[PDB]
Amino acid sequence: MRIVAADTGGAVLDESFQPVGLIATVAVLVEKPYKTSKRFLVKYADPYNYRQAIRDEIELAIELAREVSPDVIHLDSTLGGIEVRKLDESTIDALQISDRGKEIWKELSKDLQPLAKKFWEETGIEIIAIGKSSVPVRIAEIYAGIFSVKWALDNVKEKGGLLVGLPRYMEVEIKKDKIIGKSLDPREGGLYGEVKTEVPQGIKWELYPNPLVRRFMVFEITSKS
Amino acid sequence: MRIVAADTGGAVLDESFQPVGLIATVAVLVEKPYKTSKRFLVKYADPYNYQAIRDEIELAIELAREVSPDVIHLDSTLGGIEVRKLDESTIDADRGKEIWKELSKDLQPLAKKFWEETGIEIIAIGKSSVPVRIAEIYAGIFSVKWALDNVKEKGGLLVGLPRYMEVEIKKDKIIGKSLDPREGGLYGEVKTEVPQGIKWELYPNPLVRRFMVFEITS
Amino acid sequence: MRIVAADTGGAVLDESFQPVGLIATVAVLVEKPYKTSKRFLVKYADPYNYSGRQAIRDEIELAIELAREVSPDVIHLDSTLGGIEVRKLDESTIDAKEIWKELSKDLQPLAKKFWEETGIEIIAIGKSSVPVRIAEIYAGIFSVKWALDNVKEKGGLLVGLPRYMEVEIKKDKIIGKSLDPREGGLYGEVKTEVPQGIKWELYPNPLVRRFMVFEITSKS
Ligand SMILES: [Mg+2]
Ligand SMILES: [Mg+2]
Ligand SMILES: [Mg+2]
């Protein structure tokens, strides 16, 4: 099975760990053995001017899918595997979720449903709201963490610093020519990602637990002085 | 403490990872340090034609008549109440209360007799029990053994393992381990014939996070 | 950020893994990089004489005591309530339960007085807090130190550890680590004299998945 998935992750935090805005939306193509992705796209938001996220996700997943022709698209909404092209107010009412959840997806339907309908009509490919059950979604999330770190390394102010809140229980490792992202949960079976980049000089970095949010890590960049 | 527990796990999957039916029910004897089992029984189902709790309680009782444990752990998370005490009244203390109210007809007296016979309680503990989890891991292990023994006649097989466990295939045995270090190093080991001219692989079920797939081909 | 947290943990188990009483209440000071604590306080309870109201009472005073020494930015209390400030804990905001209305009459004045002196909030954050988890691990460690220090001659002792943590015995030390790598490598360290004439082992509580047991047995 060949799967395209998307997710949004990585947040700029202030020095007191308060979220400021999200950084990266990533679409991935995942194939057997379903541990990583070698083909992916990134879209960067502006964290300092921050759901537009799920709109960027479905749009980016569709763009990648048009290139690689997967069997299915996985969307990060935990709905049971229902097709997005079939998401109307009635089918949402039949979903076992919160009333605000239903309210939220009724609003989103207006933008997502027509998009998935048109893509399906063109390809026969379904976009499914599978959410947290999906490994490709988790891999997308992992890549969003890596790309958020890459973004921070590329944009950190001279003599300045930057805190990036990573997606849940993942770590990044810095190499001279790339960033490696890995789930910290061995139960996931070894999910990981790698992205090439140039690591700049004059800065230090540190990965540590977000003291306010258990199982979430922070990647902090500080300037050398 | 010496414990017999039972569970059912391992599933045949189609090529699109959709489950077809369960494979193995396993009863285990577990003693200190409660990380593995050395004495165990297995009962296979017909996955292509798939109540597990009935086979679980029987296979547990069966092993118990051979090793005489202090207690039996049944896979039903009820906080530890004795099964022989499970009658419609005691049950009432929601869809679940309804289903347990059906099972209790055959199970309650079955455990009553056993307790009178042996002085051994059958407690409904489920998710809290380490022995139950050890039984589950072995069910995974035997599901792989089942797969090894059926692949030649089937050509290719996808086995869905129980949650977050891996298997490793060595010279004369299958080793299974929990992937969750929080469980404290739970593992199992089963000696078996490894047929030749096969290739196998372990990888994430892309549709079910934290579940692994054991794939074997000829 | 500098945070003082507290929690109670470590249990005495009987032969059949049944909890008897809790052992240690620990306040910890946690700073960057938020993996451990190098300054901490402990109060031992009497496990054989132990509802759970005393623990959070002992927790808040130990935290305040520690806070007066190290002056943190905030205090974390083990109670998951989204992070409400304890000094603002009365009927109207609690109602937004019957337990806390009993607790508030003691805790709220403590928090109010402390905030008045320092401006430091005591927040009911609970499980979201890393420093609370670090306090919990230290409770596990001090519980082992307690067991080592108090095991009878030719007697034994079962210590029920807090959730998914391990302890390692070293020559002059007890080390505690979380068994969940998702937490990012949280650990603790406590200096102590390890008694002779005793053996130990660490193994899964068979009745409580993901909880470990640390057992002391006397050599013969
Ligand atoms: Mg998402
Ligand atoms: Mg079961
Ligand atoms: Mg507590």
PDB file of C-alpha atoms in Angstrom, chain C residues 25-213:
ATOM      1  CA  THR C  25       6.415  13.205  50.181  1.00  0.00           C
ATOM      2  CA  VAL C  26       9.077  15.100  48.231  1.00  0.00           C
ATOM      3  CA  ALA C  27       9.476  18.724  47.173  1.00  0.00           C
ATOM      4  CA  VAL C  28      11.945  19.350  44.350  1.00  0.00           C
ATOM      5  CA  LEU C  29      13.547  22.369  42.722  1.00  0.00           C
ATOM      6  CA  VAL C  30      13.722  21.866  38.963  1.00  0.00           C
ATOM      7  CA  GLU C  31      15.637  24.076  36.510  1.00  0.00           C
ATOM      8  CA  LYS C  32      16.859  23.763  32.935  1.00  0.00           C
ATOM      9  CA  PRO C  33      17.194  21.328  31.353  1.00  0.00           C
ATOM     10  CA  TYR C  34      14.252  19.976  33.395  1.00  0.00           C
ATOM     11  CA  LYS C  35      15.396  16.336  33.649  1.00  0.00           C
ATOM     12  CA  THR C  36      16.259  16.100  37.344  1.00  0.00           C
ATOM     13  CA  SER C  37      16.574  18.003  40.623  1.00  0.00           C
ATOM     14  CA  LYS C  38      19.727  18.872  42.583  1.00  0.00           C
ATOM     15  CA  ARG C  39      17.947  20.473  45.538  1.00  0.00           C
ATOM     16  CA  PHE C  40      15.094  18.683  47.279  1.00  0.00           C
ATOM     17  CA  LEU C  41      13.361  17.945  50.588  1.00  0.00           C
ATOM     18  CA  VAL C  42      11.699  14.804  51.927  1.00  0.00           C
ATOM     19  CA  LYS C  43       9.114  14.019  54.579  1.00  0.00           C
ATOM     20  CA  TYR C  44       8.476  10.374  55.392  1.00  0.00           C
ATOM     21  CA  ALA C  45       5.012   9.257  56.468  1.00  0.00           C
ATOM     22  CA  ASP C  46       4.189   6.204  58.560  1.00  0.00           C
ATOM     23  CA  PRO C  47       3.149   3.621  55.936  1.00  0.00           C
ATOM     24  CA  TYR C  48       1.871   1.265  58.628  1.00  0.00           C
ATOM     25  CA  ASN C  49      -0.361   4.085  59.860  1.00  0.00           C
ATOM     26  CA  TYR C  50      -1.702   5.863  56.782  1.00  0.00           C
ATOM     27  CA  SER C  51      -7.718   9.319  53.263  1.00  0.00           C
ATOM     28  CA  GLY C  52      -5.198  11.001  50.984  1.00  0.00           C
ATOM     29  CA  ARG C  53      -5.862  14.483  52.317  1.00  0.00           C
ATOM     30  CA  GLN C  54      -2.729  14.495  54.479  1.00  0.00           C
ATOM     31  CA  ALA C  55      -0.465  13.997  51.461  1.00  0.00           C
ATOM     32  CA  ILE C  56      -1.383  17.182  49.552  1.00  0.00           C
ATOM     33  CA  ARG C  57      -1.282  19.069  52.851  1.00  0.00           C
ATOM     34  CA  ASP C  58       2.227  17.728  53.467  1.00  0.00           C
ATOM     35  CA  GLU C  59       2.996  18.393  49.792  1.00  0.00           C
ATOM     36  CA  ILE C  60       2.077  22.086  49.886  1.00  0.00           C
ATOM     37  CA  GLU C  61       4.016  22.866  53.076  1.00  0.00           C
ATOM     38  CA  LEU C  62       7.144  21.046  51.906  1.00  0.00           C
ATOM     39  CA  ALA C  63       6.985  22.945  48.603  1.00  0.00           C
ATOM     40  CA  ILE C  64       6.522  26.300  50.349  1.00  0.00           C
ATOM     41  CA  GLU C  65       9.362  25.502  52.744  1.00  0.00           C
ATOM     42  CA  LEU C  66      11.590  24.719  49.757  1.00  0.00           C
ATOM     43  CA  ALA C  67      10.318  27.749  47.835  1.00  0.00           C
ATOM     44  CA  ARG C  68      11.279  30.111  50.686  1.00  0.00           C
ATOM     45  CA  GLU C  69      14.865  28.886  50.310  1.00  0.00           C
ATOM     46  CA  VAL C  70      15.270  28.849  46.507  1.00  0.00           C
ATOM     47  CA  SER C  71      12.657  31.461  45.333  1.00  0.00           C
ATOM     48  CA  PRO C  72      11.175  29.809  42.212  1.00  0.00           C
ATOM     49  CA  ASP C  73       9.038  31.412  39.512  1.00  0.00           C
ATOM     50  CA  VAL C  74       6.107  29.138  40.367  1.00  0.00           C
ATOM     51  CA  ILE C  75       5.027  26.169  42.499  1.00  0.00           C
ATOM     52  CA  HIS C  76       3.472  23.041  40.941  1.00  0.00           C
ATOM     53  CA  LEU C  77       1.021  20.990  43.006  1.00  0.00           C
ATOM     54  CA  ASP C  78      -0.089  17.481  42.070  1.00  0.00           C
ATOM     55  CA  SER C  79      -3.743  18.023  41.236  1.00  0.00           C
ATOM     56  CA  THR C  80      -4.854  18.197  37.612  1.00  0.00           C
ATOM     57  CA  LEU C  81      -7.141  21.221  37.328  1.00  0.00           C
ATOM     58  CA  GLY C  82      -5.872  22.921  34.165  1.00  0.00           C
ATOM     59  CA  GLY C  83      -3.501  25.055  36.215  1.00  0.00           C
ATOM     60  CA  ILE C  84      -5.694  27.193  38.463  1.00  0.00           C
ATOM     61  CA  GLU C  85      -3.917  29.279  41.114  1.00  0.00           C
ATOM     62  CA  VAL C  86      -4.522  27.797  44.574  1.00  0.00           C
ATOM     63  CA  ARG C  87      -4.971  31.242  46.166  1.00  0.00           C
ATOM     64  CA  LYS C  88      -8.089  31.719  44.019  1.00  0.00           C
ATOM     65  CA  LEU C  89      -9.617  28.441  45.197  1.00  0.00           C
ATOM     66  CA  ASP C  90     -13.097  28.943  46.639  1.00  0.00           C
ATOM     67  CA  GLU C  91     -16.716  27.950  45.966  1.00  0.00           C
ATOM     68  CA  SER C  92     -17.433  29.930  42.782  1.00  0.00           C
ATOM     69  CA  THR C  93     -14.310  28.899  40.841  1.00  0.00           C
ATOM     70  CA  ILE C  94     -14.221  25.336  42.208  1.00  0.00           C
ATOM     71  CA  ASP C  95     -17.843  24.898  41.102  1.00  0.00           C
ATOM     72  CA  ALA C  96     -16.774  25.739  37.541  1.00  0.00           C
ATOM     73  CA  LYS C  97     -15.424  19.041  43.817  1.00  0.00           C
ATOM     74  CA  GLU C  98     -16.906  18.499  47.276  1.00  0.00           C
ATOM     75  CA  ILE C  99     -13.414  17.268  48.146  1.00  0.00           C
ATOM     76  CA  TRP C 100     -11.643  20.518  47.292  1.00  0.00           C
ATOM     77  CA  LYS C 101     -14.151  22.600  49.255  1.00  0.00           C
ATOM     78  CA  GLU C 102     -12.877  20.621  52.231  1.00  0.00           C
ATOM     79  CA  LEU C 103      -9.237  21.111  51.208  1.00  0.00           C
ATOM     80  CA  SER C 104      -9.468  24.810  50.259  1.00  0.00           C
ATOM     81  CA  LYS C 105     -10.113  25.837  53.865  1.00  0.00           C
ATOM     82  CA  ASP C 106      -6.509  24.857  54.637  1.00  0.00           C
ATOM     83  CA  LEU C 107      -4.659  25.184  51.319  1.00  0.00           C
ATOM     84  CA  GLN C 108      -6.095  28.461  49.986  1.00  0.00           C
ATOM     85  CA  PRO C 109      -4.946  30.560  52.968  1.00  0.00           C
ATOM     86  CA  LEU C 110      -1.459  29.033  52.698  1.00  0.00           C
ATOM     87  CA  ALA C 111      -1.210  29.889  49.007  1.00  0.00           C
ATOM     88  CA  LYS C 112      -2.667  33.364  49.538  1.00  0.00           C
ATOM     89  CA  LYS C 113      -0.226  34.231  52.330  1.00  0.00           C
ATOM     90  CA  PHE C 114       2.739  32.959  50.321  1.00  0.00           C
ATOM     91  CA  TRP C 115       1.698  34.856  47.193  1.00  0.00           C
ATOM     92  CA  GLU C 116       1.298  38.021  49.279  1.00  0.00           C
ATOM     93  CA  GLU C 117       4.887  37.665  50.533  1.00  0.00           C
ATOM     94  CA  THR C 118       6.479  36.741  47.205  1.00  0.00           C
ATOM     95  CA  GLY C 119       4.073  36.975  44.275  1.00  0.00           C
ATOM     96  CA  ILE C 120       4.722  33.277  43.590  1.00  0.00           C
ATOM     97  CA  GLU C 121       1.633  31.323  42.542  1.00  0.00           C
ATOM     98  CA  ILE C 122       0.905  27.786  43.654  1.00  0.00           C
ATOM     99  CA  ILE C 123      -0.786  26.110  40.692  1.00  0.00           C
ATOM    100  CA  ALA C 124      -2.875  22.949  40.610  1.00  0.00           C
ATOM    101  CA  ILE C 125      -1.427  21.570  37.376  1.00  0.00           C
ATOM    102  CA  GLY C 126      -0.960  17.846  38.020  1.00  0.00           C
ATOM    103  CA  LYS C 127      -0.018  15.381  35.291  1.00  0.00           C
ATOM    104  CA  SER C 128       1.006  17.943  32.651  1.00  0.00           C
ATOM    105  CA  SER C 129       3.934  18.931  34.870  1.00  0.00           C
ATOM    106  CA  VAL C 130       7.448  17.537  34.435  1.00  0.00           C
ATOM    107  CA  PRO C 131       8.628  18.862  37.815  1.00  0.00           C
ATOM    108  CA  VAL C 132       5.697  16.999  39.420  1.00  0.00           C
ATOM    109  CA  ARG C 133       6.891  13.780  37.689  1.00  0.00           C
ATOM    110  CA  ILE C 134      10.431  14.485  38.893  1.00  0.00           C
ATOM    111  CA  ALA C 135       9.056  14.874  42.425  1.00  0.00           C
ATOM    112  CA  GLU C 136       7.320  11.517  41.959  1.00  0.00           C
ATOM    113  CA  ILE C 137      10.540   9.781  40.871  1.00  0.00           C
ATOM    114  CA  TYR C 138      12.335  11.208  43.905  1.00  0.00           C
ATOM    115  CA  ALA C 139       9.491   9.897  46.065  1.00  0.00           C
ATOM    116  CA  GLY C 140      10.264   6.474  44.607  1.00  0.00           C
ATOM    117  CA  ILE C 141      13.968   6.867  45.358  1.00  0.00           C
ATOM    118  CA  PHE C 142      13.483   8.076  48.927  1.00  0.00           C
ATOM    119  CA  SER C 143      11.053   5.198  49.452  1.00  0.00           C
ATOM    120  CA  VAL C 144      13.834   2.786  48.576  1.00  0.00           C
ATOM    121  CA  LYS C 145      16.238   4.675  50.856  1.00  0.00           C
ATOM    122  CA  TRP C 146      13.580   4.446  53.550  1.00  0.00           C
ATOM    123  CA  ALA C 147      13.213   0.696  53.021  1.00  0.00           C
ATOM    124  CA  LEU C 148      16.979   0.185  53.062  1.00  0.00           C
ATOM    125  CA  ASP C 149      17.269   2.230  56.274  1.00  0.00           C
ATOM    126  CA  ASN C 150      14.391   0.532  58.106  1.00  0.00           C
ATOM    127  CA  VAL C 151      14.218  -3.116  56.977  1.00  0.00           C
ATOM    128  CA  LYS C 152      14.087  -5.401  60.023  1.00  0.00           C
ATOM    129  CA  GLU C 153      16.925  -7.769  60.857  1.00  0.00           C
ATOM    130  CA  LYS C 154      16.349 -11.057  58.988  1.00  0.00           C
ATOM    131  CA  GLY C 155      13.137  -9.477  57.698  1.00  0.00           C
ATOM    132  CA  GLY C 156      12.077  -8.345  54.243  1.00  0.00           C
ATOM    133  CA  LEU C 157      10.265  -5.479  52.551  1.00  0.00           C
ATOM    134  CA  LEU C 158       8.242  -4.888  49.373  1.00  0.00           C
ATOM    135  CA  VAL C 159       8.348  -1.361  47.947  1.00  0.00           C
ATOM    136  CA  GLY C 160       5.735  -0.409  45.380  1.00  0.00           C
ATOM    137  CA  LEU C 161       7.312   2.186  43.125  1.00  0.00           C
ATOM    138  CA  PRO C 162       5.473   5.070  41.457  1.00  0.00           C
ATOM    139  CA  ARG C 163       4.343   4.419  37.862  1.00  0.00           C
ATOM    140  CA  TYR C 164       6.894   3.149  35.330  1.00  0.00           C
ATOM    141  CA  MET C 165      10.113   3.998  37.099  1.00  0.00           C
ATOM    142  CA  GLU C 166      13.152   1.927  38.000  1.00  0.00           C
ATOM    143  CA  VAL C 167      15.825   2.350  40.644  1.00  0.00           C
ATOM    144  CA  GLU C 168      19.476   1.317  40.502  1.00  0.00           C
ATOM    145  CA  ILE C 169      21.566   0.713  43.607  1.00  0.00           C
ATOM    146  CA  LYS C 170      25.121   2.045  43.559  1.00  0.00           C
ATOM    147  CA  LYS C 171      27.798   1.958  46.276  1.00  0.00           C
ATOM    148  CA  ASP C 172      26.965   5.323  47.898  1.00  0.00           C
ATOM    149  CA  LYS C 173      23.788   6.129  46.032  1.00  0.00           C
ATOM    150  CA  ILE C 174      20.312   5.347  44.765  1.00  0.00           C
ATOM    151  CA  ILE C 175      19.443   6.366  41.198  1.00  0.00           C
ATOM    152  CA  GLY C 176      15.861   6.529  39.930  1.00  0.00           C
ATOM    153  CA  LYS C 177      14.847   6.791  36.272  1.00  0.00           C
ATOM    154  CA  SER C 178      11.572   6.942  34.422  1.00  0.00           C
ATOM    155  CA  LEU C 179      10.970   3.835  32.328  1.00  0.00           C
ATOM    156  CA  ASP C 180       9.080   5.914  29.721  1.00  0.00           C
ATOM    157  CA  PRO C 181      11.497   7.301  27.120  1.00  0.00           C
ATOM    158  CA  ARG C 182       8.673   9.609  25.920  1.00  0.00           C
ATOM    159  CA  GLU C 183       9.253  11.720  29.044  1.00  0.00           C
ATOM    160  CA  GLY C 184      12.696  12.505  27.665  1.00  0.00           C
ATOM    161  CA  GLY C 185      15.045  10.943  30.219  1.00  0.00           C
ATOM    162  CA  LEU C 186      13.840  12.081  33.638  1.00  0.00           C
ATOM    163  CA  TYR C 187      15.963  10.843  36.546  1.00  0.00           C
ATOM    164  CA  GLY C 188      16.946  11.448  40.143  1.00  0.00           C
ATOM    165  CA  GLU C 189      19.854  10.792  42.447  1.00  0.00           C
ATOM    166  CA  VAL C 190      20.049  10.508  46.253  1.00  0.00           C
ATOM    167  CA  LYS C 191      23.216   9.841  48.310  1.00  0.00           C
ATOM    168  CA  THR C 192      22.903   7.175  51.009  1.00  0.00           C
ATOM    169  CA  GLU C 193      24.611   4.355  52.889  1.00  0.00           C
ATOM    170  CA  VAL C 194      23.663   0.947  51.506  1.00  0.00           C
ATOM    171  CA  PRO C 195      23.320  -1.643  54.296  1.00  0.00           C
ATOM    172  CA  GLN C 196      25.153  -4.957  54.297  1.00  0.00           C
ATOM    173  CA  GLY C 197      23.422  -8.296  54.799  1.00  0.00           C
ATOM    174  CA  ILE C 198      20.655  -7.523  52.316  1.00  0.00           C
ATOM    175  CA  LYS C 199      19.693  -8.403  48.762  1.00  0.00           C
ATOM    176  CA  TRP C 200      17.426  -6.583  46.353  1.00  0.00           C
ATOM    177  CA  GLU C 201      15.634  -7.066  43.076  1.00  0.00           C
ATOM    178  CA  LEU C 202      13.431  -4.980  40.848  1.00  0.00           C
ATOM    179  CA  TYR C 203      10.551  -6.656  39.021  1.00  0.00           C
ATOM    180  CA  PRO C 204       7.059  -5.928  37.573  1.00  0.00           C
ATOM    181  CA  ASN C 205       4.131  -5.790  40.006  1.00  0.00           C
ATOM    182  CA  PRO C 206       2.131  -8.675  38.527  1.00  0.00           C
ATOM    183  CA  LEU C 207      -1.158  -7.152  39.726  1.00  0.00           C
ATOM    184  CA  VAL C 208      -0.523  -3.609  38.419  1.00  0.00           C
ATOM    185  CA  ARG C 209       0.838  -3.386  34.863  1.00  0.00           C
ATOM    186  CA  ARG C 210       3.574  -0.735  34.384  1.00  0.00           C
ATOM    187  CA  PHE C 211       4.283  -0.491  38.123  1.00  0.00           C
ATOM    188  CA  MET C 212       7.549  -1.962  39.401  1.00  0.00           C
ATOM    189  CA  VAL C 213       8.322  -3.569  42.754  1.00  0.00           C
TER     190      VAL C 213
END
